[PDB]
Design a protein around this ligand. Sequence first.
Ligand SMILES: *N#CC(*)(*)(*)([O])C1(*)(*)=C(*)[C@@](*)(*)=[C@@](*)(*)C(*)=C1*
Ligand SMILES: O=Cc1ccccc1
Ligand SMILES: O=Cc1ccccc1
Ligand SMILES: O=Cc1ccccc1
Ligand SMILES: [C-]#N
Lengths: 260, 258
Amino acid sequence: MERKHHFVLVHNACHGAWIWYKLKPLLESAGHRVTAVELAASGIDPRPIQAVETVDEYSKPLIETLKSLPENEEVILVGFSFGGINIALAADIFPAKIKVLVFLNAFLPDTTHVPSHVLDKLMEMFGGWGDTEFSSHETRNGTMSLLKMGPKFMKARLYQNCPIEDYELAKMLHRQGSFFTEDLSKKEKFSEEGYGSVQRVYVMSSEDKIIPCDFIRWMIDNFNVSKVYEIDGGDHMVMLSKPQKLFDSLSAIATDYMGL
Amino acid sequence: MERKHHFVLVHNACHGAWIWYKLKPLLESAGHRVTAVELAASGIDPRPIQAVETVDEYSKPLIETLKSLPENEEVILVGFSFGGINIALAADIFPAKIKVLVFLNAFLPDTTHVPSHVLDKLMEMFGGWGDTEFSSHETRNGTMSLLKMGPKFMKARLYQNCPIEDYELAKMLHRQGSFFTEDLSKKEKFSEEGYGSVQRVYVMSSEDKIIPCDFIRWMIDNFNVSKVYEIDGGDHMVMLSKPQKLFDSLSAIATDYM
Ligand SMILES: *N#CC(*)(*)(*)([O])C1(*)(*)=C(*)[C@@](*)(*)=[C@@](*)(*)C(*)=C1*
Ligand SMILES: O=Cc1ccccc1
Ligand SMILES: O=Cc1ccccc1
Ligand SMILES: O=Cc1ccccc1
Ligand SMILES: [C-]#N
């Protein structure tokens, strides 16, 4: 039997650990270990998003998961959507606990521009927020932009290839969230020594109506990757629409970073 | 077309609206309206259980859902497990808004004993809490008993006929909660004029390892229902293990209260 791996899964903004409920047992029946992190004010975390003012506070459960790993363990760290920024933050802290970063339908930041750069780009270009509700909360350090998806938007742009049961599930669980774009605009650049040094791949879904092909190309062109995988027929919420194929991509990724 | 109904669905302690994620579209595909209430300190409600000190504050989202229905609208009110208690409290307030109460693997309280009666009875005989963590929280109402299920208990006792994905999902979402037995011990008995006047059916699952069959017969014996339905092979989380069959049973109920 080939050596198995520890996958750490990081969800998107407005969601929580729960998105991983299909993928987790698939990975584990193959003998892998899975930790599905729950980020601050996400999922059933007890804080509201208003109380989590910075992307570091938001990402803190991921940092604590990596910190607590036994000495010399390395993981496959998968970041979904805004989870991309989370995993880059973490790779800048704990580069040698990460064997490979998996950017899954994700923001892939660079080491050249401010940390918000790919988000601000997508914000200028995205059109069709639908019933999403935007607002902001003033903190002692600046305005914080918040968002709560609307359900029409959800159906059309994130979940359009998911089983209806999954759409319904998400409507009972999604929460108000943030992309922390003001905080990220003020933060020091991601480093070449930390984040830049870690191996990285990109997994894209062919029918992602959030993160389009052009925008990925663009991000990859700013900050190259080892390898790109495509999941055929997946919507943004590929771990729900096509968990089997997402499994297949993550097993391929495990095989390229084979242990010993 | 047969007249369709509005089902209001009330989840169990330590869980939330999310448990209904399979049953809701089944009901909606058949043309019905569904409201899955998210009770206080449950699911993604932003309150911790420690901030919800009485069963009345726990139940408030249900009462507010019934209160905001248009006039003369009646619902099929379905209460799962401790959700029985919630729905009984709701019936004693808005009896005329409920066509029928559906006790689903539920606690069925009576109008003669203290509201906690059926829970105190199960609690005495129940054993094997497994890895469940019990704790105490002191309030201005006296001590409150809290519980958080442990994952081995959940697998064996709630989720054993569920798909593994459902079990994993629950592990990600279940929360510390309470059966409010102290508050329910002290509360005024449910009334004949409110709760007791409302039509009620019972729906039981044949492989429920929380609520034994004998316990159910004892409850119905203290307090009759119009009719009893059974879901063959269901564990306690019958909405997850046998959603289709639950749908079948709820259609049958709806057909009768046309
Ligand atoms: N309410 C209820 C039951 O589903 C239950 C809740 C927590 C633990 C065991 C049983
Ligand atoms: O996960 C993607 C996303 C997109 C828009 C709003 C919130 C989350
Ligand atoms: O669609 C996701 C997103 C994130 C940041 C800005 C705009 C869009
Ligand atoms: O009171 C005992 C008990 C047991 C399981 C669920 C709810 C109550
Ligand atoms: C998008 N998170």
